[PDB]
């Protein structure tokens, strides 16, 4: 079963911090027997509306395949806890 | 589901007669074929054909209309029914339309008309009235 995870990181993130964060969350999406088919970055994009008072956001796309959704659930829980990721969504197909 | 093929056949004939159709295809059975042949012999239908196809077979009736397009078959009535079956003795055989109609009967001597039932002095299950 495939999953596309899109998330937005706050526009005021330093390069090194952003790299660390994306590495951490890709590892999270990879942990629970889920293979990250491919991760990529769409750069910093203008948001159609202010989210948490931010007009811009770094857009990260990840596609991961798994037979369950433990990795996606952990990603969503840690993204909710995180104050660096603004938005996230998971689509099955 | 289907519960009276004889009634279904009679109702097919009635509906086709109302609409003044010429032919009539229905699923076949031995009792239906005997009824159709009796109708032909008596003159209520023009012709009967049997198609020995796969499955059940087919009966193809051809109806008869008189001059001025007058319908030969005035009405058909199922008498004995799955919910209540009717049998009659030879001395109690009914006359349809004072004799102008036929009562199709099922007897130990084959399915015949009420005239033949009275002549042979037998009774049986009154399948239907046709006038």
């Amino acid at each position: 079963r495939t999953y596309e995870v899109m998330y937005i990181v706050r526009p005021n993130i330093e390069e090194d911090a952003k790299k660390a964060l994306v590495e951490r969350f890709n590892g999270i999406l990879a942990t629970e027997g889920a293979e990250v088919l491919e991760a990529k970055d769409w750069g910093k994009r203008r948001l159609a509306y202010e989210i948490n008072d931010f007009k811009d956001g770094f857009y990260n796309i990840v596609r991961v395949k798994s037979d369950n959704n433990k990795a996606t659930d952990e990603f969503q829980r840690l993204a909710k806890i995180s104050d660096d990721i603004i938005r996230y969504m998971v689509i099955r197909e | 589901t289907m519960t009276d093929p004889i009634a279904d056949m009679l109702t097919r004939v009635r509906n086709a007669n109302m609409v003044r159709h010429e032919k009539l295809e229905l699923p076949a059975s031995n009792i239906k074929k005997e009824i159709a042949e009796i109708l032909k012999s008596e003159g209520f239908i023009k012709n009967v054909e049997y198609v020995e196809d796969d499955k059940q077979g087919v009966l193809r009736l051809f109806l008869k209309y008189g001059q001025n397009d007058e319908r030969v078959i005035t009405g058909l009535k199922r008498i004995s029914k799955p919910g209540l079956r009717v049998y009659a003795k030879a001395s109690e055989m009914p006359k349809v339309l004072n004799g102008l109609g036929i009562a199709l009967v099922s007897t130990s001597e084959g399915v015949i008309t009420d005239k033949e039932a009275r002549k042979r002095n037998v009774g049986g299950e009154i399948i239907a009235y046709v006038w």
């Binding site: 899109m6 937005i8 159609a48 509306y49 989210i51 938005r87 969504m89 689509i91 | -």
Partner: protein, 63 residues
């Protein structure tokens, strides 16, 4: 008239295809009705779902 998706043969609508979605979105952001855009109902459903997904991901505006 003719349906854009039926003519082009596209059998899927991607919620990240903002350029395509902007065609059927209104000036104020409302989703244009099917009777105006000419689209089929089958693909109108997919288009609406994709547009709502995009709104959620802030690609497209609510208002």
């Amino acid at each position: 008239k003719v349906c854009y998706f039926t003519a082009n043969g596209i059998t899927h609508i991607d919620y990240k295809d903002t350029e395509l979605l902007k065609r059927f979105i209104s000036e104020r952001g409302k989703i244009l009705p099917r009777r105006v855009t000419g689209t089929s109902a089958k693909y109108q459903r997919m288009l609406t779902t994709a547009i709502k997904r995009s709104r959620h991901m802030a690609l497209l505006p609510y208002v």
